[model samples]
Target: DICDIAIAQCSLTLCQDCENTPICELAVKGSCPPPWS
Candidate 1:
């Protein structure tokens, strides 16, 4: 099982003003680190 997060458009996040940003930071936290490496 995996955890997922969704962010709506609000022009606040680092992703910029775009709807539906999926967050999988936990999924690749180990392998990918530091600013989603």
Candidate 2:
């Protein structure tokens, strides 16, 4: 359970930004972000 708990906690903390919005749908799967719009 510790591993699962740690993952959940870590996931909530992260932050990021793509300075230039990409129009292309190319993406890193399972990445949290501005969906390839």
Candidate 3:
């Protein structure tokens, strides 16, 4: 799963499925990496 990455890491693992979705925003939140943030 894309969101299976470590919580300490920045941003969720966005891929062809969850990319560009509101879920991605929720998955990342404060953990969102730069540029994607």
Candidate ranking under TM-score, highest first, comes to 3, 2, 1
lDDT of 3 by residue, 1-37 (tens): 5543423344444432454545555656656655463
lDDT (Cα, tens digit) per residue for candidate 2, span 1-37 = 4323323332322212222223111222224343322
Give the alpha carbon lDDT tens digit for every residue of 1-37 in model 1.
2122211211224333223323333333433444541
What's the distance in Å from true for residue 18, model 1?
A: 18
In model 2, what is the error at residue 35, expressed in angstroms?
Answer: 21
Candidate 1 wrongly placed segments (more than 4 Å): 1-23
> Which candidate tops lDDT?
3
Candidate 3: minimum summed lDDT over ten consecutive residues — where? 6-15
Name the TM-score of candidate 1. Answer: 0.21
TM-score of predicted model 3? 0.27
Best by TM-score: 3
Model 1 collision count: 0
What range of 10 consecutive residues in model 2 has the weakest lDDT sum?
20-29
